[PDB]
Amino acid sequence: KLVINKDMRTDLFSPPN
Amino acid sequence: DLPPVAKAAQVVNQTLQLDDSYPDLDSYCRPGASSDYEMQSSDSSWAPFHVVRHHNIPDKVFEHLNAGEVFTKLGLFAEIGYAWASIDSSLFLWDYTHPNPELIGYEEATHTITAVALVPPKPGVFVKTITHVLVVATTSEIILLGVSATPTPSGSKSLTLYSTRMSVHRGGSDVSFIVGTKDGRIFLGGESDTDIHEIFYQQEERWFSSRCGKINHSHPFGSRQQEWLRGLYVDDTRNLLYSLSNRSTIRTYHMEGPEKLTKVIEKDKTSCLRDFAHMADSSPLFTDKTNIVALSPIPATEASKLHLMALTDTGCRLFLSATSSASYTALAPQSMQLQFVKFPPRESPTRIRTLSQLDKTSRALDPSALGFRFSPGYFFDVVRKHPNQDMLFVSAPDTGRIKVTQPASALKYFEQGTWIELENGNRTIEIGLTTAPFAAAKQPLGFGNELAVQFDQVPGEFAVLTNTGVHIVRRRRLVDIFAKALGNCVSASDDALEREVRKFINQYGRVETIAAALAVACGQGSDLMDRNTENLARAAFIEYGGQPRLASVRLSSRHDALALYLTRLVRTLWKAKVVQVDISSTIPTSKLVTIQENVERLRNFLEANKSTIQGLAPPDIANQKEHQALHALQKLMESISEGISFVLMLFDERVSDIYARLDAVSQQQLKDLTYEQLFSQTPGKELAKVLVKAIVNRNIASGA
Amino acid sequence: DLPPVAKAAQVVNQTLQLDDSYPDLDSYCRPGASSDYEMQSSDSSWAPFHVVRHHNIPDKVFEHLNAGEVFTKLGLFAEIGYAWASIDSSLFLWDYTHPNPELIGYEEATHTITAVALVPPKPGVFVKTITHVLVVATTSEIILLGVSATPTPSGSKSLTLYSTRMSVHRGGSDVSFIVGTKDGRIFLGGESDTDIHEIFYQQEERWFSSRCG
Amino acid sequence: RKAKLLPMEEALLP
Amino acid sequence: LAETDFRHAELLCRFYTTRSRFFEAAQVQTNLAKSDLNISLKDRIILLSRAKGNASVNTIGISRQQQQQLNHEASELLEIAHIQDDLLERLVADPRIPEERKAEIEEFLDGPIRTLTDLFNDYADQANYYDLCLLIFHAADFHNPRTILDTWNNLINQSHFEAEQRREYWPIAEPPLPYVYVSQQIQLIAHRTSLDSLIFPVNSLLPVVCAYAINNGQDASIGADPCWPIQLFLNLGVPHALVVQVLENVLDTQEAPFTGRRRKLVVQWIAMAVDMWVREVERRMGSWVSELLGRADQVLTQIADAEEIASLRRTVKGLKRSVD
Amino acid sequence: ELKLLLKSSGQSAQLLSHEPGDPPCLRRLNFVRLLMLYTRKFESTDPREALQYFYFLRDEKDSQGENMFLRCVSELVIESREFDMILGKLENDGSRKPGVIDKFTSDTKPIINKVASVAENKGLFEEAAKLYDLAKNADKVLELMNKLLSPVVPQISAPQSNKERLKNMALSIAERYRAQGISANKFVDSTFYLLLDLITFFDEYHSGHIDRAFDIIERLKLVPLNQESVEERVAAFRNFSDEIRHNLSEVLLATMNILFTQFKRDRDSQLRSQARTLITFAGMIPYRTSGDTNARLVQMEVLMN
Amino acid sequence: EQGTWIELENGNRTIEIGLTTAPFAAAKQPLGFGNELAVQFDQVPGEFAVLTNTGVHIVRRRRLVDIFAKALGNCVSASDDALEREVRKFINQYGRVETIAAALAVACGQGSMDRNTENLARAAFIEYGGQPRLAAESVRLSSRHDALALYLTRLVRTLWKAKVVQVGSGSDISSTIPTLVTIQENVERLRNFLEANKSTIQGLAPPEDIANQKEHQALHALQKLMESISEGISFVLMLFDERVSDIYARLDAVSQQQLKDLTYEQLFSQTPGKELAKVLVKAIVNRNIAAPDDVVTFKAQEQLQRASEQAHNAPVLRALLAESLRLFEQVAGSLTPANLTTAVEQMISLKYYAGAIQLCLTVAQQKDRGNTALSWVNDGKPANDSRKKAFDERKICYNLIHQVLDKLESDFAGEPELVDGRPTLAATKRMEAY
Incomplete structure (x- = not known):
């Protein structure tokens, strides 16, 4: 079961908080 | 200040220099020793070589061979795809690529044939259509035959023989080895003694000199002990000739002139052993009992110092340097020294898949019966542990690891290896190269860069002649391995690809790996499921391409991969002159077409994924310069395609006619116009606008 | 001028000559003295050597060792991967690479064993399946045994002993040191004096000589 | 067939 | 004790396997990898790898269906866990990623096995890990011919770039030519995919590789075997009868880059493929192959390297005899 | 032999006939049939003489293209089964004593494959191997030799058994294929020498030479013994010949039973660790009798602890 | 010297120390003898058994590649400019070339996560390999190139100058079979690493200029040697896989004596070595019969050889003959006089007269499609002209046709043209031929 969702992710190249 | 195509051209120029800085052989085979191998199963997608097809010996040759009264022999003409078999005084040639070949028989000879070879002709002697000379040595004489090996529509040379009236009586010395130089010089040796003879021949008959002569270059006399030859080896790049004796003595001869041959070095096994003892690592694999079974010259284009590889019967590769006493008067060397040793691998071949010090004791290649080396280091070893079945060890330099290794002092002779099994009864006889000699550059630095030439020359193929047939072995490129590995990931998870990709990154680095994915995505390797493999390659290019970052910016590995791939597609063009003045084109038209197709397929790939590939669509300073850099590369691609189309248009007309009706400055500008200037510099564009304005003028005169 | 694989073969030849020109011992140990060292911690990544495994002495010889009355001794046959222990007039061999080794014993000796060694055999004396000769020196005799260390089949060489009917009186001079040459010559020495003795042994029985001297 | x-x-020229 | 101690569940699995209750062991090993217990990902790879083995062989009493029902579940997870592991390994070593985020990733990935959706979006696709994106499509039975092919194109190009940058730099050892590294990245998928038709469609991928071999000039110019795209797919296990079926489709359509005098190379591929086919039949096809080789000859005359073509025509006409 | 006989083009016609496009006053003889009848009488126990008459058909072919003389020698060998006499016996020392057909043509590669081809199609592998090996066609020899070995890999090699009679011929083909440097493609060849090693692994295992047998399996790197090698060994199993995957069940059990025996005789930790390795490998591999095997493997590991 | 202290845990006394591996020797004379670096891939590292009263401890010598690999292992988690620091230690001791050669070796799987280490080694090989420059035309190649030549040389040092075979009367191979396989696997690993990083290794991809160009040329040369080395070894393994001495016994003397003193160097990089390989394969092909052009020719000889090995079965014999002819004709233009003659003779022996003639005519027409011969005869056969060759290649075919017709009337001397009315088989072959 795979579902691509380019819309809302988490910037892999920016730190958190 | 600097426009897009000029910016991208700067990246190309710096990428070309990076590929041409690939370490030279002397730099990673420094004095010392190595046992670095990564072994691969022959059925693995990571295998460095693999068998692609086999060609049985024709049944009629078996009829003649088993009809042999005293003596038979087999050999290879791999340069033209032919094999041959001699039976007593009769010789039979045939094209082994053909499925049902006809036998070219030659039975004029009166005595037993002892050697046969195919050499280049002496210039200015024969009609241009004669491509080779066939040398046939018997126990009574040596015979020269003209050969014309013209290619056919099927892809296999058509062979026709010509008589010459050129022959000489052999004499008392056996002839078992014949070698030819680039200039058509023919050298002979055998199993009677260590003397080297040369055959001369000329077109004109004279009252004081025959059309064909023979001389002994060794000038022997006095007391001589028993010793004979095991092989002869030529290196045209150094004008050298090497002989190997049955006592493992290596003799070096220098061709100081078109008719001279001078012995300049003689190095016996004791000397090799003394050098070996002075090395840090001595080994029981090389002693006074050990035999040297084969030599392989290393050309000056590949390495300056290392001249020669010598293979022991224990499987050790001895790399010898040679040096001249002076720097000026070709210059002949006067000394030879064993400098570096590559010791055998440890893994033995197995039916079932089995699971940091210098390994100097492995017996895996013991005994080595036959050995061959081809630039940039492809090594074939016939290991004969059992008297019925040969095992083939085949290895290549780990080009990916050598290219990434840093610093230079950490360079070692890393290798990828594999075992190819031949069936019971297959005795290997000879191995020869079927494709053009490998060369990624014109000097040692850059010479061995397999990665750079993945798309400019076909992978090397090697014909392995046995007593039952000819097996074709092909070198596998990174893109071949990457495509095959991805083909196994078609039925697996998102994490299955990431795992396989990480193997490639750890060996080749991220840029080279992503460049391979881009290439596979563009259809490279498909000349060999395929839509899914290309779609997986696309997924790898997107997901693992990285991103741009502040250190002046560091562009993503996805960008460098695109620049690397594009550069390698045009490396044969960039710095080359467009024309050669009767004006003609430097690059053959057929080559310009394939290059253009490759560039266009790359462009088509970027367009079909403008929405999914990061940086193509417009987007903070990092992603900005990423977009600008990628944009500049794409503008260079379309400029490259336009430039190539312009050159093709030009030579479809009558350029010499256009060149005549032209001013001197524009003739001179066209004389030294490079493809780089045409693609990325205004003067090339301005000159292009002049040429089009001139060709149409001429086209109107023809008025088609 | 020269083709590609020919230029490369030249570099290889030169490279070979470079490695074979590595300095000889005489030229970096010239008359004089030296104290040049770079020391490395045992656990360092630069350590020139390191321990790779250890093999405990099997318990069945620890029992025999404590059963000793007067003399015990240990020794090594590193070239075939065997160790040995003598207890008085008894001898025990075992393969130390093996985890649960069998004891190969030889207890025919009448007097205390003082030295044992593993030596190449003299050519043309024994059947080809005999790889070595086991010399056992007691306070009374020097005994020769045939040995086959053939590689059945996985780790160390399976080992079998053969009697030879070859023995010499030990004489007055103790034997603590036994060495052998390439060609099977056997030399002896010890702690009674500086004299060096040699053992000859032959195939034939002759009336005037003996098989073993 | 004999070639x-x-x-x-x-x-040979010329 | 297995419920709260990994190293005690180890014995229970050993208890069953010495008694030869193999299913019951894989039943625990699988149920343990799916657990909420503090177990490293690389251990869960061992668990599922042992579970896959223990559930591969019959065990007395337990059905064949329940045996495969467990082997299939364990095998699926192992494929995913391998992606997740190979993904984490690459993300951590990725210079493009901040050292602050890498710790946030490692805690999330280095433990239980996540969904392919999580692995694809928040990680694999962003980093442009095209090779691992394909493995996810395969492991997810992802039905879409285009995106699969688009990802293959990006994977080939990014691979070509990394190899051309290396060759330009040479970088400790002489790096490989571009097509070699591209060939490696396909083999890596091919073995790992097990040659599924969805993510490895020779119908489309082989033209792409053959196109890349032209548009990026990986040919005799750089010393490469001109037939390296064919040699790649054949040796990977692709049927000869299919490769020749594709080259047939390429030679007729004449869609770029397979146009003009570049079709001389298409025939060379066809000669190599068919030659390797008859040599593989004579070691151990119909009218349509003979129809092709003869039609391939028109191309060589239509193109009439004057000696290369001539020698090639006589290699084609040789194969036409070998088939008829 | 005087160009006076009027042969009948078609071989499907009667013995005597008048061609349709010829004058009625002349007749034609189906010469091919004529000899074919005469030969059948004495072709069964007098082959040598038959060939002498088949030679006259050398100049004719059939509808399928085969050379009539060559085809007649194929049919005569398939029926008479006179291989040593007519084709030349290839001894187990590497010699090829020529046969009676060698006199008539030196290209004996096709028919030896023709005769070898049918005998292969009739499940007579042990013969097809000897015949293919006579023509030095190692691609087929090793292929068939792979099929004949896999069933007998774990079996007990006993005097005059089918294992000895096949192992001993395989070894006589291994020497002659190494001494002469012959080999098939690495797939066929790798499997062939791999089986030969396994056959040695069980011959040592069934003899009680546990130490020696353990060493062999370790070299092959077929079964992982340290946890680190599991990933790569598992991937290799996917592309290894099914003649190998078939015998994986017996290999794991023998290897386990080997460690099992050595345990009853630190080292304990090492065997315990290796025991685990075999299980996880078998757990991740779908293979023959994985049910009974995976269970037994786990039980033997429990008794160790 | 490099030294260290090893503590074996207390209370045990050392008794003896012995060598377990084969005695070390890099050369056979004092010069080169002690070069550990040259043999770290040929020889097992020295192992030593240390006997104490509690047990035997095993001590192993660590090579350059072992130290380099483990040191890199300490740089995985560590920084970026920490690698540069660690590499410089190696450079200041072993030299740049030796250091980079070690990185190459570790990148290729040599050495004592292992993937991170190999990737790190690869990175060092790239970033620290240096570059080509011109001296004071002449160019100094990069350390990356020297490293590659150094690593490759050490892999083949045992066999490079060695004779391929040993002859007592028809027998042996100098280098063992298992060692040739490992040498091959090692070389193929190297080659693979180069391709798998064609893009990022500087000098591998195509290209102040003269420097980078000659760097590119030298690296290309090295790579062609590798595949040649692989082919060569693959060839020798094939030799001793077939019946070898059987070939040798049925050879010439120049062919027998060339094979005698044939070195691996010659096989790898000299023409006479390639030529002899061709001779040998040719022999084993025309014996199982006893490039689609060079492949077909072999199968044709195999078909014709099997035909002659028959009991005469019109179906089988005719099939083999018909097919043999079919195949030969496909490669007519490439057939050599020796192969044609033998083929025709074999066909003549099997009464295949027409077939033999048809092959000769076909070969004549293929070696001259422009009819240079017809014009050379129509011009009076001017000496010094270069159509003579074209005419000679047809005359060899025409002569062989004479032999066929000659042998035909000979074979059927006394045979009647008619028997019982209709034509014999001997008559029909006369008509079919003519």
Whole structure:
């Protein structure tokens, strides 16, 4: 079961908080 | 200040220099020793070589061979795809690529044939259509035959023989080895003694000199002990000739002139052993009992110092340097020294898949019966542990690891290896190269860069002649391995690809790996499921391409991969002159077409994924310069395609006619116009606008 | 001028000559003295050597060792991967690479064993399946045994002993040191004096000589 | 079939 | 004790396997990898790898269906866990990623096995890990011919770039030519995919590789075997009868880059493929192959390297005899 | 032999006939049939003489293209089964004593494959191997030799058994294929020498030479013994010949039973660790009798602890 | 010297120390003898058994590649400019070339996560390999190139100058079979690493200029040697896989004596070595019969050889003959006089007269499609012209046709043209031929 969702992710190249 | 195509051209120029800085052989085979191998199963997608097809010996040759009264022999003409078999005084040639070949028989000879070879002709002697000379040595004489090996529509040379009236009586010395130089010089040796003879021949008959002569270059006399030859080896790049004796003595001869041959070095096994003892690592694999079974010259284009590889019967590769006493008067060397040793691998071949010090004791290649080396280091070893079945060890330099290794002092002779099994009864006889000699550059630095030439020359193929047939072995490129590995990931998870990709990154680095994915995505390797493999390659290019970052910016590995791939597609063009003045084109038209197709397929790939590939669509300073850099590369691609189309248009007309009706400055500008200037510099564009304005003028005169 | 694989073969030849020109011992140990060292911690990544495994002495010889009355001794046959222990007039061999080794014993000796060694055999004396000769020196005799260390089949060489009917009186001079040459010559020495003795042994029985001297 | 050996005249120039 | 101690569940699995209750062991090993217990990902790879083995062989009493029902579940997870592991390994070593985020990733990935959706979006696709994106499509039975092919194109190009940058730099050892590294990245998928038709469609991928071999000039110019795209797919296990079926489709359509005098190379591929086919039949096809080789000859005359073509025509006409 | 006999083009016609496009006053003889009848009488126990008459058909072919003389020698060998006499016996020392057909043509590669081809199609592998090996066609020899070995890999090699009679011929083909440097493609060849090693692994295992047998399996790197090698060994199993995957069940059990025996005789930790390795490998591999095997493997590991 | 202290845990006394591996020797004379670096891939590292009263401890010598690999292992988690620091230690001791050669070796799987280490080694090989420059035309190649030549040389040092075979009367191979396989696997690993990083290795991809160009040329040369080395070894393994001495016994003397003193160097990089390989394969092909052009020719000889090995079965014999002819004709233009003659003779022996003639005509027409011969005869056969060759290659075919017709009337001397009315088989072959 795979579902691509380019819309809302988490910037892999920016730190958190 | 600097426009897009000029910016991208700067990246190309710096990428070309990076590929041409690939370490030279002397730099990673420094004095010392190595046992670095990564072994691969022959059925693995990571295998460095693999068998692609086999060609049985024709049944009629078996009829003649088993009809042999005293003596038979087999050999290879791999340069033209032919094999041959001699039976007593009769010789039979045939094209082994053909499925049902006809036998070219030659039975004029009166005595037993002892050697046969195919050499280049002496210039200015024969009609241009004669491509080779066939040398046939018997126990009574040596015979020269003209050969014309013209290619056919099927892809296999058509062979026709010509008589010459050129022959000489052999004499008392056996002839078992014949070698030819680039200039058509023919050298002979055998199993009677260590003397080297040369055959001369000329077109004109004279009252004081025959059309064909023979001389002994060794000038022997006095007391001589028993010793004979095991092989002869030529290196045209150094004008050298090497002989190997049955006592493992290596003799070096220098061709100081078109008719001279001078012995300049003689190095016996004791000397090799003394050098070996002075090395840090001595080994029981090389002693006074050990035999040297084969030599392989290393050309000056590949390495300056290392001249020669010598293979022991224990499987050790001895790399010898040679040096001249002076720097000026070709210059002949006067000394030879064993400098570096590559010791055998440890893994033995197995039916079932089995699971940091210098390994100097492995017996895996013991005994080595036959050995061959081809630039940039492809090594074939016939290991004969059992008297019925040969095992083939085949290895290549780990080009990916050598290219990434840093610093230079950490360079070692890393290798990828594999075992190819031949069936019971297959005795290997000879191995020869079927494709053009490998060369990624014109000097040692850059010479061995397999990665750079993945798309400019076909992978090397090697014909392995046995007593039952000819097996074709092909070198596998990174893109071949990457495509095959991805083909196994078609039925697996998102994490299955990431795992396989990480193997490639750890060996080749991220840029080279992503460049391979881009290439596979563009259809490279498909000349060999395929839509899914290309779609997986696309997924790898997107997901693992990285991103741009502040250190002046560091562009993503996805960008460098695109620049690397594009550069390698045009490396044969960039710095080359467009024309050669009767004006003609430097690059053959057929080559310009394939290059253009490759560039266009790359462009088509970027367009079909403008929405999914990061940086193509417009987007903070990092992603900005990423977009600008990628944009500049794409503008260079379309400029490259336009430039190539312009050159093709030009030579479809009558350029010499256009060149005549032209001013001197524009003739001179066209004389030294490079493809780089045409693609990325205004003067090339301005000159292009002049040429089009001139060709149409001429086209109107023809008025088609 | 020269083709590609020919230029490369030249570099290889030169490279070979470079490695074979590595300095000889005489030229970096010239008359004089030296104290040049770079020391490395045992656990360092630069350590020139390191321990790779250890093999405990099997318990069945620890029992025999404590059963000793007067003399015990240990020794090594590193070239075939065997160790040995003598207890008085008894001898025990075992393969130390093996985890649960069998004891190969030889207890025919009448007097205390003082030295044992593993030596190449003299050519043309024994059947080809005999790889070595086991010399056992007691306070009374020097005994020769045939040995086959053939590689059945996985780790160390399976080992079998053969009697030879070859023995010499030990004489007055103790034997603590036994060495052998390439060609099977056997030399002896010890702690009674500086004299060096040699053992000859032959195939034939002759009336005037003996098989073993 | 014995290979047809074309003549020297064609082979060597001029 | 297995419920709260990994190293005690180890014995229970050993208890069953010495008694030869193999299913019951894989039943625990699988149920343990799916657990909420503090177990490293690389251990869960061992668990599922042992579970896959223990559930591969019959065990007395337990059905064949329940045996495969467990082997299939364990095998699926192992494929995913391998992606997740190979993904984490690459993300951590990725210079493009901040050292602050890498710790946030490692805690999330280095433990239980996540969904392919999580692995694809928040990680694999962003980093442009095209090779691992394909493995996810395969492991997810992802039905879409285009995106699969688009990802293959990006994977080939990014691979070509990394190899051309290396060759330009040479970088400790002489790096490989571009097509070699591209060939490696396909083999890596091919073995790992097990040659599924969805993510490895020779119908489309082989033209792409053959196109890349032209548009990026990986040919005799750089010393490469001109037939390296064919040699790649054949040796990977692709049927000869299919490769020749594709080259047939390429030679007729004449869609770029397979146009003009570049079709001389298409025939060379066809000669190599068919030659390797008859040599593989004579070691151990119909009218349509003979129809092709003869039609391939028109191309060589239509193109009439004057000696290369001539020698090639006589290699084609040789194969036409070998088939008829 | 005087160009006076009027042969009948078609071989499907009667013995005597008048061609339709010829004058009625002349007749034609189906010469091919004529000899074919005469030969059948004495072709069964007098082959040598038959060939002498088949030679006159050398100049004719059939509808399928085969050379009539060559085809007649194929049919005569398939029926008479006179291989040593007519084709030349290839001894187990590497010699090829020529046969009676060698006199008539030196290209004996096709028919030896023709005769070898049918005998292969009739499940007579042990013969097809000897015949293919006579023509030095190692691609087929090793292929068939792979099929004949896999069933007998774990079996007990006993005097005059089918294992000895096949192992001993395989070894006589391994020497002659190494001494002469012959080999098939690495797939066929790798499997062939791999089986030969396994056959040695069980011959040592069934003899009680546990130490020696353990060493062999370790070299092959077929079964992982340290946890680190599991990933790569598992991937290799996917592309290894099914003649190998078939015998994986017996290999794991023998290897386990080997460690099992050595345990009853630190080292304990090492065997315990290796025991685990075999299980996880078998757990991740779908293979023959994985049910019974995976269970037994786990039980033997429990008794160790 | 490099030294260290090893503590074996207390209370045990050392008794003896012995060598377990084969005695070390890099050369056979004092010069080169002690070069550990040259043999770290040929020889097992020295192992030593240390006997104490509690047990035997095993001590192993660590090579350059072992130290380099483990040191890199300490740089995985560590920084970026920490690698540069660690590499410089190696450079200041072993030299740049030796250091980079070690990185190459570790990148290729040599050495004592292992993937991170190999990737790190690869990175060092790239970033620290240096570059080509011109001296004071002449160019100094990069350390990356020297490293590659150094690593490759050490892999083949045992066999490079060695004779391929040993002859007592028809027998042996100098280098063992298992060692040739490992040498091959090692070389193929190297080659693979180069391709798998064609893009990022500087000098591998195509290209102040003269420097980078000659760098590119030298690296290309090295790579062609590798595949040649692989082919060569693959060839020798094939030799001793077939019946070898059987070939040798049925050879010439120049062919027998060339094979005698044939070195691996010659096989790898000299023409006479390639030529002899061709001779040998040719022999084993025309014996199982006893490039689609060079492949077909072999199968044709195999078909014709099997035909002659028959009991005469019109179906089988005719099939083999018909097919043999079919195949030969496909490669007519490439057939050599020796192969044609033998083929025709074999066909003549099997009464295949027409077939033999048809092959000769076909071969004549293929070696001259421009009819240079017809014009050379129509021009009076001017000496010094270069159509003679074209005419000679047809005359060899025409002569063989004479032999066929000659042998035909000979074989059927006394045979009647008619028997019982209709034509014999001997008559029909006369008509079919003519």
